[PDB]
Amino acid sequence: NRRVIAMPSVRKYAREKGVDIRLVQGTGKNGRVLKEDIDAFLAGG
């Protein structure tokens, strides 16, 4: 197995944008992928 440190909202996010939290830049407590983390993943440059 391999549980991810994301929230029910962040999941919908990656599901609505097409991103995979599993590989997002989780900066939250204990590497927690938050909304800002999702935007950061898709953003950059």
From Swiss-Prot:
Residues 5-42 form the Peripheral subunit-binding (PSBD) domain. Signal peptide: none annotated. It comes from the Bacteria. Forms a 60-polypeptide structural core with icosahedral symmetry. Belongs to the 2-oxoacid dehydrogenase family. The pyruvate dehydrogenase complex catalyzes the overall conversion of pyruvate to acetyl-CoA and CO(2). It contains multiple copies of three enzymatic components: pyruvate dehydrogenase (E1), dihydrolipoamide acetyltransferase (E2) and lipoamide dehydrogenase (E3). This is Dihydrolipoyllysine-residue acetyltransferase component of pyruvate dehydrogenase complex.
